[PDB]
Each structure stands twice: as C-alpha cells, then as structure tokens.
Amino acid sequence: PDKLKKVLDKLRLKRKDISEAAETVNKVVERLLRRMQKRESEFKGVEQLNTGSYYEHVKISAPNEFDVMFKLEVPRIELQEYYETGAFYLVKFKRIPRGNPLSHFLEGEVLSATKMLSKFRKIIKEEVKEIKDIDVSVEKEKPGSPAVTLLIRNPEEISVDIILALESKGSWPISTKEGLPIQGWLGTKVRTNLRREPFYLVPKNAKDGNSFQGETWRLSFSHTEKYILNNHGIEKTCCESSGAKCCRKECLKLMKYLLEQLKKEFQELDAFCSYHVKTAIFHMWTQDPQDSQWDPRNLSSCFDKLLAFFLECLRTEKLDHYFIPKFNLFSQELIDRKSKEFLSKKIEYERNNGFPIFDKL
Amino acid sequence: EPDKLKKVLDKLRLKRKDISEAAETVNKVVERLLRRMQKRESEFKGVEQLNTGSYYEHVKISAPNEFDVMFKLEVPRIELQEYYETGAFYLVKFKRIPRGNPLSHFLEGEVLSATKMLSKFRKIIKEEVKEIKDIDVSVEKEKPGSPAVTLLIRNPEEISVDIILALESKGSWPISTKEGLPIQGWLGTKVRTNLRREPFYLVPKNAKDGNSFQGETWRLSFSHTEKYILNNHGIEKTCCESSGAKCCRKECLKLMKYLLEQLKKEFQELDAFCSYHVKTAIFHMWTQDPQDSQWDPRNLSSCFDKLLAFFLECLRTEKLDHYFIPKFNLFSQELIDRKSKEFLSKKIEYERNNGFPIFDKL
Ligand SMILES: Nc1nc(=O)c2ncn([C@@H]3O[C@@H]4COP(=O)(O)O[C@H]5[C@@H](O)[C@H](n6cnc7c(N)ncnc76)O[C@@H]5COP(=O)(O)O[C@@H]3[C@@H]4O)c2[nH]1
Ligand SMILES: Nc1nc(=O)c2ncn([C@@H]3O[C@@H]4COP(=O)(O)O[C@H]5[C@@H](O)[C@H](n6cnc7c(N)ncnc76)O[C@@H]5COP(=O)(O)O[C@@H]3[C@@H]4O)c2[nH]1
Ligand SMILES: [Zn+2]
Ligand SMILES: [Zn+2]
C-alpha cells in the first residue's frame, strides 16, 4: 500500500512544465504586464495578484494548465447579489462616475463584464505580436471563459490563463460571513487578517438563463485559497525547513490526479473540476485540524479518509463552497444525480482495487 | 550511519524556503536589465542570455546565498592565441573585422581588451540599472580580479547576481580541448559530436602572471555544455525521466557540494577550493562509472562514499584535469599547495568515518 508514495514521486515533473518551464512563462507574463500598463488604456493600473503558480505550485494538481490573475482596483462599488447563488454579483458604481475610464464599459447602471472583457482581450490580443522573442498564441473567446488563454508552444501545448479581476478593498460580501471556518484550524487571528484583504470578482457568466448575459461577476478567492494551501497546518512550521511534514498537499495531489485521469477516459465527468476537490479537502482539513491526523506515515489512511469524504459529498449531494456556505457546489441545478452516482462508481472501483488507474509501470 | 543521507537531501529543499521568491526577482530584474540593454548605441545591443540552467542553482552548487548569470555576445572570427601554455587562457586576436562591428574600439592593438570591454559593460549596466522603476537595484563596487558586475537587488535584504559577460564563438573549439569531454563510453560519440558543433565561450578572467601582459586575458567556459551533461547524465535516455528509473547522480552532487561548502564555511583554510572541483570530479566519476545501475538510489550511501574516495584520490594524487581540457590540471602543485590538500583530506576523512557530523542541522 506504500505505492502511493511511488505515485507521488513519479508525479513530480520538476523542470518539465514547472522549473525551467515555468520561469519562462513568467518572463512572458511580465512582459505583457509591463507593456500592458502602456499608453492611455482603461487598464493602465492593471497588476498581477500575489499568487502561486510559477513557484512550483501549478505542478501539484492539474499539471496541464497555467494560471495568472491581472487585478485592477476599482472605486466604491456596490454589489447587487445575483439572485441566490451567493457568488455571482452585479457590479455597480457607488457614487456617480467622475474619474474612471471604466465608464466606457457601463451597460446601464451596472458594470458590464463582456464589454470590459471584450476590450481586455483586444489589447492583449494586440500586444503579444508587438514583441517577437518567442512563439506565443492566444485562444478563441469561447463561452463560459472569463479568461484570455495564451497557448504557447515552447513547452508542448501550454495555455497560461489570464483572468481579469476586479479588486475591492471594502468589506467582504455578506454571503461569505459564516464562511472560512478556520477558527479551530488556523485561528481567529489568521481568519481576521485574511478577511481584511481585498476580495476579487472574476467575469463569469452566471448562466441562470434569461437575465444578464455578461453583466455578472463571480467572487474569486484564489488569493486567500493559496494562503491556506501554503499555510495548511496548525503548527506554523508544518512542511517547513525546521518543522514536520504532512500528507495534506500529497492527499490533494493524489485526488487531483485521480479526478484528472478519470476525466480523460470519461466525458461523463465533464461536470467536475479541480475546485470540487480543493473545496473538499478544505472541509476535510477543517474537520481534522491537528497535524497528527495528517502524519506522512499515514498517507494511505489519510487518502482513504478523503476518498470516503468525497463519496459522502456525492452521495448526499452537498459540497458547500468553503467561503460561501449557502452556495452548494454539488447542487442538482449544477450537477444531475446521475453524474454523482456515475463518479461514485469509478472512485469506489479505483478504491477497492489498489488504484489500477495509477498503473504506470 | 542510520540512512540519513536522504533526509539531508530533503532538507536541502531549503531552496524552496528562501530562494523561490528570490529567483523570480532575479529573473525579473535581469530580464528588464537585458531588454533595456538591447537599446541602440551600446556595443552589447546584440547581447543575449546564455541559458545555463535556472535560478534554482541548487543543481550545481546548491548555495543558499548568491547567484550567477551569463551574457553572450557573438563575435566574428576570433583567432585564439593560447595564453602561453594554460589551455584555458587565450588572447582574442581578430583576423578581419567586418565593417559595422561594435568591437572595434575594444582593442589594444591587434588584441581584444577584456579590461576595456568590461569597462563600458559595467558602465552601461550602471546606467540602465537605475532607470528600472519601482525596484531598488544598485550595483556594487567592483571587487578586484572578479570579472563580473555584481548586482545588488534591494528588496527583502541582499540579492547578489554576478552578471558574467562572455563572448560567443560559433566557430571551432581550440586544440587544447581536442581530447577533452571523454563521454565516448558513457554519453556516446554521437552526442559528443553534436555538443562540439555548438559554440564555445570566453570569459574575461585574468591569469595570475607577474610577468608578460595579463590585463586582457580571456578564459574558456563550457557552462552551456556542462548544463546538458547534468540534465542528460545517463547511458540510458530514460534516466531520471517519467518512463524510466531514477539515479543518485545529481543526488551525490548536492551532497558533495554541501559538504565542501560547510567545510569551506568553517575554515578559511579551504579557500583554494571551489564548486568546480566537485562538478569536475563527478564528471570523471560518471565517465569512469557509466552504467545507471552503478548509480542506484538504493545505494546512495555507497555511491556517495565512492564519490568521496574518488575525490580524495584526486587530492592526494594531485590530479584533477579540466573535463574539457586534458592539459589543464586543476589540482596541480602550482594551483593548490600540499598543505591545503592534506587539510581537506583529513577533514573529509574525518566526516566519512563518523557518519558526517557536519550534516547535523537536524
Ligand atoms: N486563477 C483563477 N481564479 C478564478 O477565480 C477563476 N475562475 C475561473 N477561472 C478559470 O476560468 C475557467 C473556468 O471555467 P469552467 O467553469 O468551465 O471550469 C472552471 C470553473 O468552473 C472552476 N473554478 C475555478 N476557479 C474557481 C473559483 N475561484 N470559484 C468557483 N469556481 C472555480 O474550476 C474550473 C477550472 O478552474 P481553473 O483551473 O482555476 O481555471 C478556470 C478556467 O480557466 C479562474 N482562474
Ligand atoms: N556562469 C559562469 N560561467 C563561467 O564560465 C564563469 N567563470 C567565472 N564565473 C564566476 O566568476 C567568478 C569566478 O572567480 P573565482 O575564481 O574566485 O571562483 C570561480 C572560478 O575559480 C571557477 N571556474 C572556473 N571555470 C569555471 C566555469 N566554466 N563555470 C563556473 N565556474 C568556473 O568557478 C568559481 C566560482 O564559480 P561560479 O559559481 O560559477 O561563479 C564565478 C565567480 O563569480 C563564471 N560563471
Ligand atoms: Zn504540512
Ligand atoms: Zn538519472
């Protein structure tokens, strides 16, 4: 049963796609950002959110993807809750427009996400050619994506995600109030210092139906989420140099590789993404706060505990958003029962047979 | 010992603890320094970066402190006049300078000047560096002999980077490296041919002669080819790959380098030794032991001891030839004196018998 340790060791693909193949992807990025803070464009104050992808972190789960956020601070913005999702909002301007080039993107009173993204893409889709240094290309604007992905073809088929995000330094939305329950895990001292940080809105189309197509934004917690990924232990020295290790990131990497390899053969699992796993292991980390329950010498037990948690999540159709309690990710609106019962069958099959899907020599 | 060589390599992840962020900052500053250094009216307009690996410079000499980067400028048809009989030191003489060349004014007669060329380079880098905006990056005073242009990248504390200028010549390799790189029975004659149809480089480092004229001596560097050997270190192409087996080659290299640093950082008496003595000794060791099976991760305790016994051999026998230049003996009597070679012999032998107590840093 100590073969998982050999899956984890084989998982690392160091330089290929992460080390020398990730500090090149950075180099392209800051070129774009610098040059993107050029002229008199609405985005002259665009900035790269402090996040972790390039620093050997895109390499843990879902290695075939790259991601970056371009934040852009806004003024006093009123948030109109979009129906009852708790995550999709309608961005308005608190006090009447005076000094902001973001009035070019106003559809009525609300800030339209398509007009802004449609023009965002046009600038980036114009300044990547303005440099010849490497072979970088951009993807098509497909529905659902609030990103402008750069398929660069230096390292196989890379696709660095550029995600425009609205930064609001005000208090967090009221739908995230009972969320982030890290009191008994990380502490009320850590939880408070994270909620006084700005929250971000990504231009995701809430496709509820007939109402606003591209005027809806979504709450992004990628900044807070990686503060939890690197600071996951109850001891501050967890997985540090002068500290003890744990199997939290490894039990995260194994569930991502399990769901990633399952979706490659079944297109009926096109309803589950890596964020279902992320949020699942957050509920499991909060349930088991002590680092003793995640000792590296219990990788098979901790992974089986996480698998039985994801099976109960599917089984009862209840995987609440870690920051937004009322927002249930495994709602029947979003995922039909048949997919839950289909994915339960494969995860159980791989769990009862020594994980044959990880059979890589 | 109680199999603690693997727990030392795992703690050598300190890279991540403190050099991850700094490596992006070095990447991001050099790049803005390089692209801003591609401006007109600068003889280095056509300068580039020689890709000699990455910032996680732990692969070579895993040092948790300072760094190095190399700049390559392509020159036209050099005539390498060997500096007397070094093998590594030359004089860059020019045959016909093609009209329109930016290296015309760096000659002190028939011979190219490393002292001059390294003057405007430092000069231009001093200019450009302070026009970089929100970042506090200044340059140090030029320490003597030292042929680089170290950069002080003020942020969290200190961040040094040696900006090493190096001429690129896509021509032929000198005669002194004609029997060097003996990878014929390890990496193959089919890859040694390709690695030598690749350019060679020259760094502005003066030789130590109280006589003749050592102001403009250039030195051979093979850091571009040394890198390939590190990442392509096995007889089997799938060594340390996804669909292959692992090996303790680079494993031993980090151990051997951290052993010498901690020893160097303990006594100044070991100041004559550098990280290139253990990279070169492991090149001969990988050539002597070519099979992947001879470097098995389950035999890390013995594969490292065997590397120790080979390195001490090179000390007590005073023989450690430059891997690309058979003539140049790095452990010669004129480079390092017997007194320092016996000192390191007792210190390494001391650690080897007592289970390496110098690695005790939990
Ligand atoms: N860096 C970043 N921060 C974000 O907030 C974000 N939100 C979306 N994306 C990227 O946009 C696309 C989302 O479309 P899709 O729904 O079909 O699948 C997505 C999406 O449904 C879901 N998802 C990802 N991040 C979030 C998030 N932060 N909150 C809710 N759902 C998310 O998981 C899938 C893949 O996520 P990523 O691998 O992070 O990159 C996604 C992807 O490019 C984001 N990228
Ligand atoms: N990237 C790079 N390629 C070079 O050829 C090179 N040559 C010198 N340097 C750097 O210049 C200084 C050398 O002065 P010192 O002799 O006291 O110690 C040097 C020098 O004695 C020795 N050396 C000899 N040949 C090489 C070589 N081909 N590559 C690296 N180091 C070499 O190595 C020692 C330091 O190693 P580095 O860690 O690579 O960085 C050095 C350092 O900043 C180089 N840096
Ligand atoms: Zn940990
Ligand atoms: Zn190998």
Swiss-Prot record, chain B:
Span(s) of short sequence motif Nuclear export signal: 9-14
UniProt crosslink position (Glycyl lysine isopeptide (Lys-Gly) (interchain with G-Cter in ubiquitin)): K126, K190, K227, K254, K257, K264, K265, K319
Catalytic activity from the UniProt record: GTP + ATP = 2',3'-cGAMP + 2 diphosphate; GTP + ATP = pppGp(2'-5')A + diphosphate; pppGp(2'-5')A = 2',3'-cGAMP + diphosphate
Interaction with collided ribosomes as annotated region, ranges: 184-225
PTM annotation (N6-lactoyllysine): residues: K11
Gene Ontology MF terms in the entry: 2',3'-cyclic GMP-AMP synthase activity; ATP binding; chromatin binding; DNA binding; double-stranded DNA binding; GTP binding; metal ion binding; molecular condensate scaffold activity
Glycyl lysine isopeptide (Lys-Gly) (interchain with G-Cter in SUMO) cross-link site: K72, K190, K227, K237, K319
UniProt binding sites for Zn(2+): H233, C239, C240, C247
S-palmitoyl cysteine lipid attachment residues: C247, C248, C314
Modified residues (5-glutamyl glutamate): E157
Cysteine disulfide partners in this protein: none
Annotated ATP binding sites: S54, E226, K257, S275, Y276, H277, V278, K279
PTM-bearing positions, type Phosphoserine: S54, S146, S275
Positions bearing N6-acetyllysine: K227, K237, K257
Mutagenesis or variant effect for K346R: Abolished monomethylation, promoting interaction with PARP1
Outcome reported for the amino acid change (mutating K95E): Impaired tethering to chromatin, leading to constitutive activation in the absence of DNA
EC number, as in UniProt: 2.7.7.86
Chain span(s) of sequence motif Nuclear localization signal: 136-146
Subunit: Monomer in the absence of DNA. Homodimer in presence of dsDNA: forms a 2:2 dimer with two enzymes binding to two DNA molecules. Interacts with nucleosomes; interaction is mainly mediated via histones H2A and H2B and inactivates the nucleotidyltransferase activity by blocking DNA-binding and subsequent activation. Interacts with PQBP1 (via WW domain). Interacts with TRIM14; this interaction recruits USP14, leading to deubiquitinate and stabilize CGAS and promote type I interferon production. Interacts with ZCCHC3; promoting sensing of dsDNA by CGAS.
Protein name (Swiss-Prot/TrEMBL): Cyclic GMP-AMP synthase
Portion of the parent chain present: 146 to 507 of 507
